[PDB]
Design an enzyme around this catalytic site. Structure first.
Site, mmCIF file in Angstrom:
data_model
loop_
_atom_site.group_PDB
_atom_site.id
_atom_site.type_symbol
_atom_site.label_atom_id
_atom_site.label_comp_id
_atom_site.label_asym_id
_atom_site.label_seq_id
_atom_site.Cartn_x
_atom_site.Cartn_y
_atom_site.Cartn_z
ATOM 1 N N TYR A 1 9.185 -8.645 -6.014
ATOM 2 C CA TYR A 1 10.079 -7.903 -7.305
ATOM 3 C C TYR A 1 11.196 -7.607 -7.088
ATOM 4 C CZ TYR A 1 5.326 -7.644 -10.053
ATOM 5 O OH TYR A 1 4.407 -8.066 -10.505
ATOM 6 N N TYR B 1 -8.477 -5.011 -1.947
ATOM 7 C CA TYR B 1 -7.120 -4.540 -1.797
ATOM 8 C C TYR B 1 -7.122 -3.376 -0.710
ATOM 9 C CZ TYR B 1 -2.368 -2.886 -2.787
ATOM 10 O OH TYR B 1 -0.899 -2.704 -2.763
ATOM 11 N N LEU C 1 7.435 0.920 -6.258
ATOM 12 C CA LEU C 1 6.320 -0.039 -7.027
ATOM 13 C C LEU C 1 5.043 0.413 -6.508
ATOM 14 C CD1 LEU C 1 7.679 -2.173 -8.807
ATOM 15 C CD2 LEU C 1 9.143 -1.624 -7.013
ATOM 16 N N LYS D 1 -1.126 3.578 -2.111
ATOM 17 C CA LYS D 1 -0.422 3.844 -3.452
ATOM 18 C C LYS D 1 -0.731 4.987 -4.216
ATOM 19 C CE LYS D 1 1.448 -0.148 -3.356
ATOM 20 N NZ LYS D 1 2.896 -0.307 -3.038
ATOM 21 N N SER E 1 4.124 -13.446 -4.386
ATOM 22 C CA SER E 1 5.037 -12.963 -3.411
ATOM 23 C C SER E 1 4.376 -13.264 -2.123
ATOM 24 C CB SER E 1 5.573 -11.605 -3.624
ATOM 25 O OG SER E 1 4.746 -10.714 -3.393
ATOM 26 N N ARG E 2 5.469 -13.099 -1.159
ATOM 27 C CA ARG E 2 4.937 -13.182 0.236
ATOM 28 C C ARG E 2 3.643 -12.110 0.445
ATOM 29 N NH1 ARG E 2 5.190 -14.123 5.290
ATOM 30 N NH2 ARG E 2 6.385 -15.597 6.383
ATOM 31 N N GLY F 1 13.362 -3.717 0.446
ATOM 32 C CA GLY F 1 12.178 -4.549 0.146
ATOM 33 C C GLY F 1 12.607 -5.971 -0.290
ATOM 34 N N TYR G 1 0.413 -0.033 -7.540
ATOM 35 C CA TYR G 1 -0.583 -0.775 -8.022
ATOM 36 C C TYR G 1 -1.807 0.088 -8.646
ATOM 37 C CZ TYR G 1 -4.446 -4.510 -8.071
ATOM 38 O OH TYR G 1 -5.447 -5.008 -8.241
HETATM 39 N N1 LIG Z 1 1.476 -8.369 -7.466
HETATM 40 C C1 LIG Z 1 2.224 -8.020 -6.468
HETATM 41 O O1 LIG Z 1 3.025 -8.847 -5.561
HETATM 42 C C2 LIG Z 1 2.404 -6.388 -6.500
HETATM 43 C C3 LIG Z 1 3.541 -5.729 -5.693
HETATM 44 N N2 LIG Z 1 3.540 -4.365 -5.815
HETATM 45 C C4 LIG Z 1 4.633 -3.600 -5.041
HETATM 46 O O2 LIG Z 1 5.953 -4.213 -5.114
HETATM 47 C C5 LIG Z 1 6.828 -3.695 -4.036
HETATM 48 C C6 LIG Z 1 7.384 -5.201 -3.521
HETATM 49 O O3 LIG Z 1 6.318 -5.925 -2.995
HETATM 50 P P1 LIG Z 1 6.255 -7.754 -3.116
HETATM 51 O O4 LIG Z 1 7.826 -8.015 -3.719
HETATM 52 O O5 LIG Z 1 4.964 -7.986 -3.719
HETATM 53 O O6 LIG Z 1 6.696 -8.090 -1.769
HETATM 54 P P2 LIG Z 1 7.601 -8.887 -0.951
HETATM 55 O O7 LIG Z 1 6.881 -8.743 0.275
HETATM 56 O O8 LIG Z 1 7.881 -10.209 -1.546
HETATM 57 O O9 LIG Z 1 9.039 -8.150 -0.917
HETATM 58 C C7 LIG Z 1 9.450 -6.857 -0.157
HETATM 59 C C8 LIG Z 1 9.695 -6.521 1.258
HETATM 60 O O10 LIG Z 1 8.777 -5.852 2.031
HETATM 61 C C9 LIG Z 1 9.410 -6.106 3.371
HETATM 62 N N3 LIG Z 1 9.153 -5.348 4.593
HETATM 63 C C10 LIG Z 1 8.019 -4.664 5.206
HETATM 64 N N4 LIG Z 1 8.333 -3.702 5.733
HETATM 65 C C11 LIG Z 1 9.500 -3.541 5.685
HETATM 66 C C12 LIG Z 1 10.337 -2.298 6.078
HETATM 67 N N5 LIG Z 1 9.820 -1.610 6.594
HETATM 68 N N6 LIG Z 1 11.637 -2.416 6.080
HETATM 69 C C13 LIG Z 1 12.315 -3.436 5.325
HETATM 70 N N7 LIG Z 1 11.411 -4.489 4.769
HETATM 71 C C14 LIG Z 1 10.338 -4.485 4.911
HETATM 72 C C15 LIG Z 1 9.507 -7.432 3.543
HETATM 73 O O11 LIG Z 1 10.500 -7.831 4.402
HETATM 74 C C16 LIG Z 1 9.836 -7.897 2.083
HETATM 75 O O12 LIG Z 1 10.980 -8.575 1.948
HETATM 76 C C17 LIG Z 1 5.584 -3.173 -2.899
HETATM 77 O O13 LIG Z 1 5.861 -1.730 -3.079
HETATM 78 C C18 LIG Z 1 4.560 -3.575 -3.550
HETATM 79 O O14 LIG Z 1 3.138 -3.023 -3.053
HETATM 80 C C19 LIG Z 1 2.720 -3.643 -6.423
HETATM 81 C C20 LIG Z 1 1.609 -4.377 -7.239
HETATM 82 C C21 LIG Z 1 1.478 -5.710 -7.185
HETATM 83 C C22 LIG Z 1 -0.051 -6.035 -6.621
HETATM 84 O O15 LIG Z 1 -0.215 -5.908 -5.248
HETATM 85 C C23 LIG Z 1 -1.055 -6.697 -7.318
HETATM 86 C C24 LIG Z 1 -2.409 -6.754 -6.945
HETATM 87 C C25 LIG Z 1 -3.416 -7.242 -7.909
HETATM 88 N N8 LIG Z 1 -3.098 -7.409 -8.829
HETATM 89 C C26 LIG Z 1 -2.266 -6.968 -9.540
HETATM 90 C C27 LIG Z 1 -0.905 -6.740 -8.889
#
Ligand SMILES: NC(=O)c1c[n+]([C@@H]2O[C@H](COP(=O)([O-])OP(=O)(O)OC[C@H]3O[C@@H](n4cnc5c(N)ncnc54)[C@H](O)[C@@H]3O)[C@@H](O)[C@H]2O)ccc1C(=O)c1ccncc1
Ligand SMILES: NC(=O)c1c[n+]([C@@H]2O[C@H](COP(=O)([O-])OP(=O)(O)OC[C@H]3O[C@@H](n4cnc5c(N)ncnc54)[C@H](O)[C@@H]3O)[C@@H](O)[C@H]2O)ccc1C(=O)c1ccncc1
Ligand SMILES: NC(=O)c1c[n+]([C@@H]2O[C@H](COP(=O)([O-])OP(=O)(O)OC[C@H]3O[C@@H](n4cnc5c(N)ncnc54)[C@H](O)[C@@H]3O)[C@@H](O)[C@H]2O)ccc1C(=O)c1ccncc1
Ligand SMILES: NC(=O)c1c[n+]([C@@H]2O[C@H](COP(=O)([O-])OP(=O)(O)OC[C@H]3O[C@@H](n4cnc5c(N)ncnc54)[C@H](O)[C@@H]3O)[C@@H](O)[C@H]2O)ccc1C(=O)c1ccncc1
Lengths: 60, 229, 60, 229, 229, 60, 60, 229
Positions: H15, H181, H169, H189, H221-222, H8, H171
């Site tokens: 993250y 969401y 990870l 989740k 993040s993206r 990821g 949420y």
């Molecule tokens: N704030 C946030 O960014 C956040 C992030 N997360 C979790 O953290 C993890 C990382 O997400 P991120 O860093 O935000 O995202 P990211 O997109 O920056 O990085 C992770 C990767 O997902 C990858 N992608 C998608 N499908 C695939 C696949 N099948 N194989 C390989 N690569 C893939 C993509 O290429 C990317 O590099 C996920 O499980 C999230 O849901 C959980 C909670 C929070 C959140 O969404 C939140 C929302 C509202 N208020 C508070 C928190």
């Protein structure tokens, strides 16, 4: 004796309430949640399992 | 004068029947949505009075079944049924069995209803534990056991008056681990419970409709026995 | 305007159910729980708050 | 033929009354436990008919109040009564207002009951946030708002019929932080909720009596307006 | 250069010691708060070297104990001290063992600290199940096992550096019923857990101090063996 | 054999993690929480019990 | 301004801890859970969000 | 000497990168599993030093990336990739990108590892709310965001030594409602969290491996921006 018979026996032996759980028991709670009597309840997970969900550790 | 659609009855041994019974005690008309695999057989049994002594109610009452319709929660709309199941031995003679179709059929035949009961679940790999469940099976458990609730709501919400109520059934395995409840069914229950809240917000704010879920104890029904452990 | 008035204003704004919560809304639920209709329920904390409890952060 | 004891009342703007009104629909006899300090004044309003409109039951019936009795949830038995109150202008003319005394009193005048309601809360320092609450204020909150429940159960189980039911009122502040709700009330509601489980186990296995709590939303009563934040 | 105050110790078989040993790995100075009744005897063992083996840090280092002090979590300040204890053979020779006194004492001898540990629990009637626990026993449990935490925070925040951390020990019995864990200890652990949130809000916004609790599994110490069910 | 010995026997049998729980197991977790490494955590009840808390009913 | 900017602003204004949440904050907790230091923790949902999850009702 | 596979990462703004950074501080070798849609671009950026000033660590340290491999959590095994994505512009040049293949590739090239990080999620209909999410989209959110974790474990558990740890990870939207969401991500989740327990039981008992999940606060993040609301 399949997963379910085990679950029934254990529940009837360790649940707060000893009575056998009947379909009508869940039926009357469902009837209640569906009636206006519960007009203020929503989005909830309501347990109807003779209280087994509240236990952490058994006894015997 | 309340009408309730119950989805998930295929015999008088599950929770649906018990729910239909208690609803009858308060004199609410009941419509049974029945899965095609066991539709005719159910009809036959009902017709030959094989359920007769099960529709009995303490207060002498006798369940009042408004209608019994074929229904498969796997399909949202008619354009969803695959050609195979479409030409299948059990589904051929049948029609209007998708969620959209039955919703429409109900409204067209009885008007708006005000009670909706989701009493079903299914998973092809329930016998296997999570780790050994395949993507196919896992997505199947969630499609049939959890998504059906959302789709069910989306289509019925429109044939439901304000202040109507919806309910579904769940199991504690979603919150605490119970080995043996596999195939991703514990995962489907966890989603159903979370979706029950998200839906309550939306259905609440936009339609003034309530939705709750019941976490039931053990019952020896057809589904339950399917576990085999 | 007292802690209580703020709470009710907030509840009537962000809660899933928009109607005003009545003392009898809790009463009806209480009635049901004190009856045999809920013979399979025990040790539970049942919410009768128009669903406010399911919300994380207000959409405002 | 069902009798319910409602402990914790002072007026018709609280939950006790709302519960009393609804139970009347099922024709259950109600007995009110009133905090001594306001017992007389309460009887006044009543005698002078200030509650007549609040007693009309939806069903076009009159709420059946079997009795109003002085009740103080801070005293388990007569020997727990201290000098200061024994001299308190408002307790003088009264008697048999401790938990055990009213339990015996009811049991002697009307026999056994099958419904118990714990609907009272008190915290001298509710206006202060946890960190500024003294040991005395904190414990006063737990004694009055929590231990009282356990005590009611201990003494009332003796005068209850089999399969009787019990309920108490709580607030979500025990699980999530709501600033302003202080004096250790949040603490008390957290213990009341945990105790409800433990009491359910014991009361369930031993007497087959059920106990549950209702986490309510806001109601502008009087004990709620005294919080003022 | 980091100092940690561990309140609640008597021997090396408890959690306080395990926490003390691990913190030593990060080279934090430790100050032990010992319940007066066992302070002397504790100092005895120590002086006579009964804890030398239990002090060897994994890293082949000696646990750095900055100081051992008499501490009683049932007294907030000197004025809270009652006559009976003021005569208690075990408190006579001692002084400055109330929460505020040791807070000032530490602050005067070693300045400010940045780590606080609440590791003490007490319930006179732990051997009885909730329903057979007196008001005194119940409140003694909450005062000693719960309010003590809130009090520690109130008086110790003054002597802590910014961004300091705080922790306490709890047990899952507060959420799920484990028969045998009585005397209102379950009640106390339920309030301790709820208070941890509320204290985190206030301590976080106002001082930027964090507070968390560890729900631990079984450890055969001494305060745990006294439960005996 | 005291309430405590029963609890440890039960934990070492039905808990997700089979190893014996050490006072230092809780200590290490405590260390981490008292440090800046966990500067984004607060008001939480963190379980260090070999996972026993996630179990509903024993598989025995 | 998309869902996420709203979420960041609200968190930084209503969370127990005021500091901006950084990826490294979740990173160091993840490092901990992955290390032997947490050998006794398992099956848990550990919050690392400056305590926002503990709140029910805001303030301003 | 610890090796950790992170799934990821597609840039230094999520993250994962933050996790890889903190892991490097403790000197653990890191292998990045990268999604094909943005694989080459990532490689190019890394190669031209466009991440150079992001691999910096307070202690002067500079992240130590062991390997960077193409990886798509949508596929369990090679026989799972559909012909289309197989001949797709981004996947053609690539190979060994299924969960099974990368797991094998890792073991074959570095032996058994002992840390596994699931840092990904995806949902085609995240912009739509639950009620309006289609079965297709819903099952997609669960397949990519939840099932990938289980499949990831199943294959890696075999190339992991005993006492290894796994984390993912999540949420809070899974437990409390957050409008916006959508796409069924809150549902995914909720399943991930429930599966984290079921898996902990099995991985615990059979391999002595741990698995936990982290509920994170907001990060721009993206992925997060994808929500658009
Ligand atoms: N704030 C946030 O960014 C956040 C992030 N997360 C979790 O953290 C993890 C990382 O997400 P991120 O860093 O935000 O995202 P990211 O997109 O920056 O990085 C992770 C990767 O997902 C990858 N992608 C998608 N499908 C695939 C696949 N099948 N194989 C390989 N690569 C893939 C993509 O290429 C990317 O590099 C996920 O499980 C999230 O849901 C959980 C909670 C929070 C959140 O969404 C939140 C929302 C509202 N208020 C508070 C928190
Ligand atoms: N004990 C139980 O039987 C139990 C049942 N539930 C839920 O209660 C509901 C009813 O299940 P049940 O009555 O046990 O089962 P049932 O099979 O007796 O009746 C329901 C119907 O599912 C129907 N079927 C499957 N798919 C479809 C479809 N797509 N369209 C139409 N019909 C379909 C099927 O034809 C059947 O008539 C489900 O949502 C259950 O998961 C929840 C919890 C418990 C439980 O599993 C449990 C396990 C261990 N300990 C305690 C409790
Ligand atoms: N009024 C509300 O909105 C509310 C009420 N409750 C509970 O409902 C119950 C009573 O309701 P009210 O308080 O709503 O009703 P009343 O029924 O207005 O007040 C309760 C009684 O406390 C009694 N009193 C104090 N000590 C004693 C004693 N020792 N013996 C006898 N009587 C005594 C007093 O005489 C009074 O009659 C309590 O257990 C409450 O905590 C729980 C939650 C809510 C709530 O506080 C709230 C706050 C913020 N946002 C949302 C909801
Ligand atoms: N020992 C366990 O297994 C265990 C321990 N804890 C908590 O860990 C903490 C201490 O651990 P032990 O109790 O394990 O460690 P010690 O650290 O053995 O005991 C604690 C201290 O209480 C102190 N004491 C009483 N009142 C005071 C006072 N007023 N001032 C100063 N000292 C006082 C006493 O001197 C003693 O040193 C307490 O907060 C406990 O409740 C929480 C959970 C478990 C537990 O009880 C349990 C039970 C059943 N199954 C699983 C786990």
């Amino acid at each position: 004796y399949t997963f379910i018979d085990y679950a029934i026996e254990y529940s009837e032996k360790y649940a707060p309430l000893r009575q056998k759980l009947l379909s009508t028991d869940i039926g009357s709670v469902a009837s209640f949640l569906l009636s206006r009597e519960s007009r203020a309840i929503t989005g909830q997970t309501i347990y109807v399992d003779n209280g087994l969900n509240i236990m952490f550790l058994p006894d015997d | 004068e309340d009408i309730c659609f119950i989805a998930g009855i295929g015999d008088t041994n599950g929770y649906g029947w018990g729910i239909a019974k208690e609803l009858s005690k308060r004199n609410v008309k009941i419509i049974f949505g029945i899965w095609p695999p066991v539709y005719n057989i159910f009809m036959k049994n009902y017709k030959n009075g094989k359920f007769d002594n099960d529709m009995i109610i303490d207060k002498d009452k006798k369940m009042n079944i408004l209608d019994m319709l074929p229904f498969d929660a796997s399909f949202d709309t008619a354009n969803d049924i695959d050609e195979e199941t479409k030409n299948n031995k059990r589904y051929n003679m049948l029609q209007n069995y998708t969620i959209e179709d039955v919703a429409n059929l109900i409204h067209q035949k009885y008007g708006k209803i005000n009670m909706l009961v989701h009493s079903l679940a299914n998973a092809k790999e329930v016998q296997k534990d999570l780790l050994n469940t395949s993507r196919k099976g896992y997505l199947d458990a969630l499609s049939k056991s959890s998504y059906s609730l959302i789709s069910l709501c989306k289509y019925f919400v429109n044939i439901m008056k304000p202040q109507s109520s919806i309910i579904s059934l769940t199991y504690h395995a979603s919150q605490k681990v119970v080995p043996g409840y596999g195939g991703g069914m514990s995962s489907a229950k966890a989603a159903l419970e979370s979706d029950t809240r998200v839906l309550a917000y939306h259905l609440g704010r936009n339609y003034n409709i309530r939705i709750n879920t019941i976490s039931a104890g053990p019952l020896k029904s057809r589904a339950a026995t399917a576990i085999n452990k």
